[PDB]
From a paper:
Primary cilia have elevated resting internal Ca2+ concentrations ([Ca2+]=300–700 nM [Delling et al., 2013]), and possess at least two TRP channels, polycystin-2 and polycystin 2-l1. These ion channels are encoded by the PKD2 and PKD2L1 genes of the TRPP subfamily. In contrast, polycystin 2-l1 shows significant and relevant Ca2+ permeability (PCa/PNa ~6). Here we present a structure of the full-length human polycystin 2-l1 protein at 3.3 Å resolution in cryo-EM.
The overall architecture conforms to that of other TRP channels, and in particular to the TRPP polycystin-2 structures. As characteristic of group 2 TRP channels (TRPPs and TRPMLs), polycystin 2-l1 has a long S1-S2 extracellular loop, termed the polycystin mucolipin domain (PMD). In contrast to the 3 or 4 observed glycans in polycystin-2's polycystin mucolipin domain (PMD), polycystin 2-l1’s PMD has one clear glycan density located at residue N207. Polycystin 2-l1’s S3 is a near-continuous helix extending from the membrane-spanning region into a pocket created by the PMD. Finally, a disulfide bond is present between residues C210-C223 in the PMD, similar to several polycystin-2 structures. The S6 helix of polycystin 2-l1 remains α-helical throughout its length, whereas the S6 helix of polycystin-2 is broken by a middle π-helix element, before continuing to the C terminus. The key filter residues of polycystin 2-l1 are L521, G522 and D523, in which the carbonyls of L521 and G522 point to the central pore axis. The narrowest apertures in the selectivity filter, measured by HOLE, have radii of 2.6 and 2.8 Å at L521 and G522 respectively. These distances represent a larger opening than that in any of the three polycystin-2 structures (1.0 to 1.4 Å). The relatively larger size of polycystin 2-l1’s pore radius (2.6–2.8 Å) may enable partially hydrated calcium’s transit, thus avoiding the larger energy required for pore residues to dehydrate calcium.
Author numbering:
A (entry chain C), B (entry chain A), C (entry chain B), D (entry chain D): 101 to 172, 181 to 343, 351 to 381, 384 to 456, 480 to 561
Amino acid sequence: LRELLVYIVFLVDICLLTYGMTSSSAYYYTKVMSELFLHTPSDTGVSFQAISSMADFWDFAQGPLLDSLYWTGHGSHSFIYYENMLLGVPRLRQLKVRNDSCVVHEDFREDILSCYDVYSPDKEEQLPFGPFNGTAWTYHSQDELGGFSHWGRLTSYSGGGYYLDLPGSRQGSAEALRALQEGLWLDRGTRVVFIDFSVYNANINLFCVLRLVVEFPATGGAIPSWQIRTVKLIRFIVGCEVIFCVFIFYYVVEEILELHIHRLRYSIWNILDLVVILLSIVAVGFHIFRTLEVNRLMGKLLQQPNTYADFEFLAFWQTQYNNMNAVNLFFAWIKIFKYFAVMFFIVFFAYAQLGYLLFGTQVENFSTFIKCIFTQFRIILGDFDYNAIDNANRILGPAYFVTYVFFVFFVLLNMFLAIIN
Amino acid sequence: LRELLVYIVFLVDICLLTYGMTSSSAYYYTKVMSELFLHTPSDTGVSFQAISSMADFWDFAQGPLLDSLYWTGHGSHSFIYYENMLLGVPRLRQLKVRNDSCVVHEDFREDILSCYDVYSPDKEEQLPFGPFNGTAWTYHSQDELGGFSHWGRLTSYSGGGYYLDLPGSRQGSAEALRALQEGLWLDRGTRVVFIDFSVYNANINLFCVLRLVVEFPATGGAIPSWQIRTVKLIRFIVGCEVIFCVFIFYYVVEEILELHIHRLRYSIWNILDLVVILLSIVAVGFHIFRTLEVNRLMGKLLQQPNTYADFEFLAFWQTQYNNMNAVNLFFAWIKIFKYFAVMFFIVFFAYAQLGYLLFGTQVENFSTFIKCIFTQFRIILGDFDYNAIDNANRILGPAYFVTYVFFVFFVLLNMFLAIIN
Amino acid sequence: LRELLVYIVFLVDICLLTYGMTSSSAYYYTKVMSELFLHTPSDTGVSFQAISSMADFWDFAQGPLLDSLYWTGHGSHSFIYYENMLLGVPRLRQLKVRNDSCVVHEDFREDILSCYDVYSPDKEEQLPFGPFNGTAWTYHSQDELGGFSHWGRLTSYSGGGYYLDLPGSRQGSAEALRALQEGLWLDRGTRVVFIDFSVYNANINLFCVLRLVVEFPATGGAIPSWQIRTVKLIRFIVGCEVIFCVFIFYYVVEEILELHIHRLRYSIWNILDLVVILLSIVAVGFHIFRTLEVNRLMGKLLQQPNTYADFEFLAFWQTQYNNMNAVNLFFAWIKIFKYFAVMFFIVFFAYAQLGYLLFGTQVENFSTFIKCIFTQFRIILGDFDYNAIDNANRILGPAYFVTYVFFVFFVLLNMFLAIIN
Amino acid sequence: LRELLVYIVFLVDICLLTYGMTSSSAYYYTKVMSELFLHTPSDTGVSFQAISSMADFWDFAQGPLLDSLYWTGHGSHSFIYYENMLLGVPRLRQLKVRNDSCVVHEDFREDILSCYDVYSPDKEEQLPFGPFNGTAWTYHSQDELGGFSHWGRLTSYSGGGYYLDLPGSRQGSAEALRALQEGLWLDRGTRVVFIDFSVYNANINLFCVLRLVVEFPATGGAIPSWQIRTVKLIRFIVGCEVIFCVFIFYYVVEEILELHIHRLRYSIWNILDLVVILLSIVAVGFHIFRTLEVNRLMGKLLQQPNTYADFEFLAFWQTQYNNMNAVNLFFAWIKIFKYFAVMFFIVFFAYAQLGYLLFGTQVENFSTFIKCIFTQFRIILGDFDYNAIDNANRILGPAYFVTYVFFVFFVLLNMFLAIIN
Ligand SMILES: *[C@@H]1O[C@H](CO)[C@@H](O)[C@H](O)[C@H]1NC(C)=O
Ligand SMILES: *[C@@H]1O[C@H](CO)[C@@H](O)[C@H](O)[C@H]1NC(C)=O
Ligand SMILES: *[C@@H]1O[C@H](CO)[C@@H](O)[C@H](O)[C@H]1NC(C)=O
Ligand SMILES: *[C@@H]1O[C@H](CO)[C@@H](O)[C@H](O)[C@H]1NC(C)=O
């Protein structure tokens, strides 16, 4: 039709555009790259998904990441598999928090005088502490480095300081970090230690970026997380987009001509048009930023080759970019169709609240309030761990469980008997 | 309204009161604290969740709890992570049972003369047995120590004797326990060995208590259990409670004025009022007991610092306290609404009884009668282990299973056909 | 009533009789006893649930069963935990099969001349093969030993020969089995090697028996199985039974007086009476056999203490005895109520047959025809392993799976629409 | 009947024919054979299901496959268990791809000059590269070897070159492969390395074949797969088939006599006849090919015993043969009965597409488009891994999950309310 088949042409263009850079050879690259640094055992046998102390972080960052980064085809650019190059050098930016962040209660004094705190956008340390200026002991601002607010497991973070751009040799990084041990760069009151680098292979034209987080909470310990993102970086790779750039102006006019002479009563198909139109401009804006930044970053590197080229910013934005391409593509696929629970939610969150207060600690599920909707929703499906509800209190755990399951069955049965006719 | 909005004000006060001490930074403290002592391997590789013998308990209590408690910021109060202090010293109270507890049957004599027994509140040993008075070999009563009845995995316990308050140094505790080996303090007929201590950090104001149970049943072996509880201990932290203290007297009067001139016919909303009123007085009584006992326990410790300050009593009562706050909070959330199976249960417990007698041993599920309701109820949901029903007898296991599942489907189908109209 | 309340008295007597010997302290004894021999690692690290070769069976039977049986309270009767005695000595009976059991096909000769076979009640070796008479190299009949037909994993067995009653000392059993290695007692064509012994504790009066099977199939390898059974052995322990003996004669008369003057038309409540009556005589017959055999077996042992007292026979019959007590108890509990699929089964077994022929090997589920009803029934519930259906052929696996699940949903939906009214 | 009972006779003949060679002793042979080479640890502890690097492939192929193939009843034909012979010798055929396969983009030059590629039927290396002619360094065509197109995990393959027929001794294969290391036969740009051999036992007359794939993708790493197939090879074993050969001509005539004088309107029972008739000729053709090829392969081996007898071709065709026997047997069992979703699929594949683009990498499920129908169909059943949807992005993962599950429940509920009457 003159109005429907145009949208199919718009579909197949926006389909072929999203799949334009959809390497079908990416998730095995994520396998090799994830399970080369994460799951590798050390000499004493510590891996990144199973780090919890602090003295073994300095075994992880000297055995399975220093003896797992520097190979010597092979030249001097440190191909990590022999099939993908290390571009730039990693860096280790550390947040800290300060001693008088909050005050201890007066029952405990005289021994417990220094009182660190949970991380907030306030309460950091904008102060140097080490022996002499070496960049790794001096704070640097949020806009001297430009790194966006990382989102870890507990709370968000910022563009913190104390970073150390690594050298590019096996003996060099060991003589850096071993001399960094006795300085105690990881002192008592750290909140996150990052380590960031990235690698690129020729064979399928994919940049993969690797962010490795070792966060030391206020309670103690270490609860690690990783973030491996693998996308195209680059892109006849460009001519399919100039027909896609037409459709934004093609559809905003057909929207506003209905909106210009609109009546005083405007359905959800209008916002269905709007949510897929507004994401398109955000998508097409990112290409210019990529073509500036990727070129700037390799221009920064072919002279002065020992420097951290920051790929994490446009890596995160490229990842949210093709996430947004997936989401507006899905909205386009749903747009092809253009041809009581009040007594349930307030008790649903009540059982969630009961599960959060009973099962506070002792379970790493049920542990914030949101996760007490996701767990308590998975229980409606059938994924549950009763051997850690019954291993928590032994009296109210099963008492919660049996009557919650009977409540779910009662409320799923009650609605249908009067709605069947 | 004048009767409904007051209850919302009562809700938001009782909500903010329960969340007054709801550290959102507690379950990672339970992670670090649990997985620092439980899951730590020894030199020969024994962990607390995987202890079963008796000669390896004395490797667990000399490698991963003696080389995992005494670190040397750092002073002399034994910060276990470098971020949480060891307050007091642990202790090791041991129950025992006596030789003539029950008599062997007459077919077996002449070799099997000593006959220990399952644990009961009777049948203990109120007798010293070691070389000389050192507190670890002499019984102490239930009210010389004051410890409540612990509830282990098999049956309850009492405030038993034989305890050993540990010293506060690395060489000292090793010279204690190594000299305690050749005395054979853990002899043949023990029923529980406890070890209790607790740690507190400044950074978020939480007391976590740790009770570690190694119980040696009448059959032999060891089947360990732990109990880690982590709560506030302390608490402008107090002024939100004086408005909450008003509402008890506010609502008991409005209950009894209906009850004073009551008719001769009193619904379940009355006991709905009663169950949330009666828990409130029990809740507000605990604060005075905390403010006495926490102060007494740190008064006991700043002079004579080498002593066990008993936190387990008010720790258990604080834990049942905020459990009760969760339960009456849930009853308040359910109280916002104030604006045939006879041929199924007797066969349900019959299949439970059949499963208990067929699957007696060989499965650590199905193993008491209650657990044959919880397992045989989980089978209605979908969590089951058919590779240990079929690995038990191979003939009646599947015969039980298939016809029980067909019975559940038949009785879940039969009720709906006549109730649909 | 005069007919109903008598049955309740019969219930409570038959309930208290079955629970007369229902040690509530048995499944932890099965835990300690199972996980003391099964899951124990060797020096080179082989456990009984993970044995598959033949040269490591002789590490399992020299490290974690010879250094895990002989401890030196402690006398000379080999308490294995220090809390349960080793009564008698173990023995190792071996079946074999003969060289000309079946003939190879004529394409393969000249190299493959000896042709052993799958086990049958025929085709054994009633022949000695070792150097000299020592009982371990000479066949013994099915009625020289009296052992019942064991049922292993593949097929049944018989009372085979070649057994070796072990000595009762640490050096003695090692000098037995090490001298038994170079004789090659486990030669190429074995089908089962057993090892049987049993242990008894005073503390709760339970005999546990342990049968450990290492079967070498015709294909090769070893696919082990165990059989641990733990029951009373013994039994004021006897006077509750003389009232139970009354009810057999009480109810057979009331059955036959209805059957003597019966009409020419006899419902399933009659066979409901019969199945619970006929099991009662079988139950009460076993007590006399226990009181003879248990007494005979300890009479065999207090003189000549170095001999295998065969507990496995009445152990198996005691286990099927209290299984039958569970089953007729369940029938009594179901008897308190005395106050199209033709187009589904033939395709059900057809999909079972398709799954057996597609998924023949490569999966240890789906592997006989029966197990292709149990697996293909578990798929209706939700326990399935799609990562070994898709890891078998990759083309017909999912093709079987998706349309079988759609068939199950179609046939579970089709029956209800016409049966709702 | 004269038309129905003939088909039952045809059933029981075609049943007994398919089960004619249905070794009930095959899946334990697959257990021993799979878990003898796959799951065996090396000296440094690498197994075949857990190989990912390249320098540890040369530990897998020198410890747990060179010290796990050559045993020294025992003669000189290398019985691998002592109960199944090694017939022939293994071989190691390697595919490669060439340097100028695709060109790098112009932003990256001067360092990244060699650019290998994903595997295709084009782009190989038909060129020798090693020092001198030894067969292992020279390409051989697809029809010099005759090996069919293997189907690995990523994409299909072909009959590639570079193979090395192994010798038949322990010292010989080690002196082959250790001298093959310094030549670097596994160089940077390999795509698959195969290793193929097969073993046969006398005891139940089964040939099992073993294909072991170590594929090095374009990204790097190694993602291994295996293929173990175990069938009869041979077959009074032949006389049951001459009655089965009658039924093809018996039923094609009864089909075409209906088809010769057929009306101008031909139901799906006709193609139901056709799909079970046409597979029968394909089945009966394979027997002649087996009787030629099995005889040729053992004729190739009794003289010149050090050669690879290719069993993989007729092994794959025998496996698809008894797969086809299972499928037409199932169609025969279904043939005994001869006596809106348009708004669901386009959003079903839309959610699949959203899951493929969100969950591209980071999950080895959800990873191609097809697997986003199999996973997103398993979610309707209940097998899902929410701890890798929530561990992927943390924002859209649960947002996808909750509304997809609510969509599935809404569309499964909506169809029944109007179809109930
Ligand atoms: C941090 O603590 C140290 C003592 O350990 C103290 O000297 C210093 O002044 C404190 N600095 C801040 C910013 O709290
Ligand atoms: C306990 O047993 C010992 C022998 O081991 C005996 O000497 C002692 O009297 C017994 N004591 C009790 C209280 O049973
Ligand atoms: C078994 O095989 C051996 C050769 O290994 C042969 O000497 C002996 O006669 C055979 N015995 C039987 C009973 O098959
Ligand atoms: C492969 O690369 C090498 C350099 O490593 C080069 O000398 C050779 O000519 C290339 N051959 C092909 C076929 O690309």
